[PDB]
Design a protein around this ligand. Sequence first.
Ligand SMILES: N#CCSc1nc(-c2ccccc2)cc(=O)[nH]1
Ligand SMILES: [Cl-]
Ligand SMILES: [Mn+2]
Ligand SMILES: [Mn+2]
Ligand SMILES: [Zn+2]
Ligand SMILES: [Zn+2]
Length: 457
Amino acid sequence: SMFLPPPECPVFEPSWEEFADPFAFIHKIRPIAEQTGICKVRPPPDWQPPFACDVDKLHFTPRIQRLNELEAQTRVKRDYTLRTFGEMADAFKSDYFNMPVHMVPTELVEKEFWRLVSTIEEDVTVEYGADIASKEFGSGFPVRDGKIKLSPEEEEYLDSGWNLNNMPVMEQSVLAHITADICGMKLPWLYVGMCFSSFCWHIEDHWSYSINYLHWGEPKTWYGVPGYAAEQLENVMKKLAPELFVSQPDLLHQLVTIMNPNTLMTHEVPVYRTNQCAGEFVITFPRAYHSGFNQGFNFAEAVNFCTVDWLPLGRQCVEHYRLLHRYCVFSHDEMICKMASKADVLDVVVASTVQKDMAIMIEDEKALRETVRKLGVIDSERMDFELLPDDERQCVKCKTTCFMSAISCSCKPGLLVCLHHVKELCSCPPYKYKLRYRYTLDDLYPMMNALKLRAES
Ligand SMILES: N#CCSc1nc(-c2ccccc2)cc(=O)[nH]1
Ligand SMILES: [Cl-]
Ligand SMILES: [Mn+2]
Ligand SMILES: [Mn+2]
Ligand SMILES: [Zn+2]
Ligand SMILES: [Zn+2]
């Protein structure tokens, strides 16, 4: 009546054999889970990573959060220890309900969350932690270091595929051999939650997958939307909260919001829910919108990742970003070429998939270069784009991160446009322009061939 809970998302309980390889398992469940956008994974009963921490030495800077539906919030950026945060969080919840924190039904907290964010009268504010691992607050999974000797139990999980520190650097991921500095995206994030602290509706940068583990504490409640419904969700959001779609100045100025899933379901957006309990994984699929809130004091860890399934979507995403003039986190083409340059050490299924994306890349690049030559750009010079700081190689028009090529003019020292935007650089005639290119077509075809050879083994 007030709140109707979405249907439950799929839950998987893999055997140890199924569970052992995360990439194989994810690939297996994909036909099911990509229809719901999120799914939950319960590890085999004895997969039990050790959690040990001194709650008095772990400290972090809390973020503060107002809970109002449709109100704009920014995506990223006082001091608590984990103990004092926990004490604040438990006291907040038990005072809010006049009940012991674990006797509050999850259904009631959910019901109450959607009441309070919708009511103008209520101004509930809460606090939470969000950051990558640091020396003041490290991963919840075991990691190697010289100062501290690990237990056999800890040593056991150092190399698990489901140890999220490993996830980026494994063989079936395509961020395995990448060099670029993208700390925000390839490293796990740590999240300290409290009752009602929430994550707004969003998809991951570059439409990547995410995997999310709840180390300990009260559950995390999720809502998820399949990738095929992303634009329908965005249309609903645009109608109700147009303020969120204004042009973003920087990459750290993305606007996001809380919105009732019933509102989406009313507008024919399929939504699924789940309560993630301690020791369970949630996986989000490419372009799957998700949001949620915490039932109480808890500690989660999450990481982005990209499988071979994702590669063509990664290309479509960058294209989508260009149309929106949205900043990129990294160059997709640069990643592809980096992998091609390491074709000999690539996993062979990876090589095969990269080869297919590269073929599309080369065909598109060939066409774009013919077009800019017909616009009268004649002069050219090789340019090592990967050496430029990222904010020094964005298209002044569409903000895309250049790598394959760009146009420059000595009239505008340091400015670049991608080849879709030759006419947006300056008023000089095109013969004053230079095509800056990373590779000639004669460079590119042998790189692609190396991938083919590797994939033919
Ligand atoms: N999405 C996702 C991972 S779960 C999570 N994510 C957050 C969050 C996300 C973006 C920015 C700040 C916090 C808070 C929290 O409790 N849990
Ligand atoms: Cl409110
Ligand atoms: Mn997310
Ligand atoms: Mn020059
Ligand atoms: Zn451009
Ligand atoms: Zn000029």
